[PDB]
Design a protein around this ligand. Sequence first.
Ligand SMILES: N=C(N)c1ccc2cccc(Nc3ncccn3)c2c1
Length: 245
Amino acid sequence: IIGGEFTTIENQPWFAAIYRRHRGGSVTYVCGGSLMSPCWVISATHCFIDYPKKEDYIVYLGRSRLNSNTQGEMKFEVENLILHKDYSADTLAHHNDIALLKIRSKEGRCAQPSRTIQTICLPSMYNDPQFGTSCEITGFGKEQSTDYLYPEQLKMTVVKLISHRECQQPHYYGSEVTTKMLCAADPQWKTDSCQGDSGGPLVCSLQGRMTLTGIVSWGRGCALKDKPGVYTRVSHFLPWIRSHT
Ligand SMILES: N=C(N)c1ccc2cccc(Nc3ncccn3)c2c1
């Protein structure tokens, strides 16, 4: 997250920190994710497509720092890693960038909701917020595009939704962005999601309820002028989410 501010997990309790274990024992951060139900985390297929072995992943709920066991956190392994069968990646644009991870503790249980661990509701069919709406994003992604390490403390910021008509303009993304994707950015281009933030939640308050409107997916640069963040539009995928869960 470029700009924004440091935060803790009690402020974004549906946030899942997804890590990968390597031969030799080192563990590294992969992407964020969102808890939609006690047993299911939704993320982005691009985060796992090149290492599609469910046994490699570690998922934490209730965690605020990248390398510290926050009081109240809980750790899980992945019982089922489901990738959309028509995922694909062009030079910039990623398609059907959506994945589901059924989670389970070592004792065989799903998540236990608490003060620092909670689900985030899915959106309804044909009803996303209008362009101009402010939505929040969260992640352990880079703080500056030229950084090579991630911040140790979780961060969050606020950005505004951009219409499909505007995002398809030539200086923005042209016909590369489709109706199955949603754009969002800062009008002053000083804050945004960045690498390391993929798979994380784009949460919008609509009709009074917080909903998982998007999943961090892609973008040219980070907080770069005329290049918004692009997010998987969850409402299009309700038939696929219900079928696979
Ligand atoms: N602009 C986004 N919101 C956004 C969202 C998701 C992204 C994921 C990976 C890489 C990016 N781009 C990137 N460019 C330069 C240095 C590091 N990352 C991204 C950008």
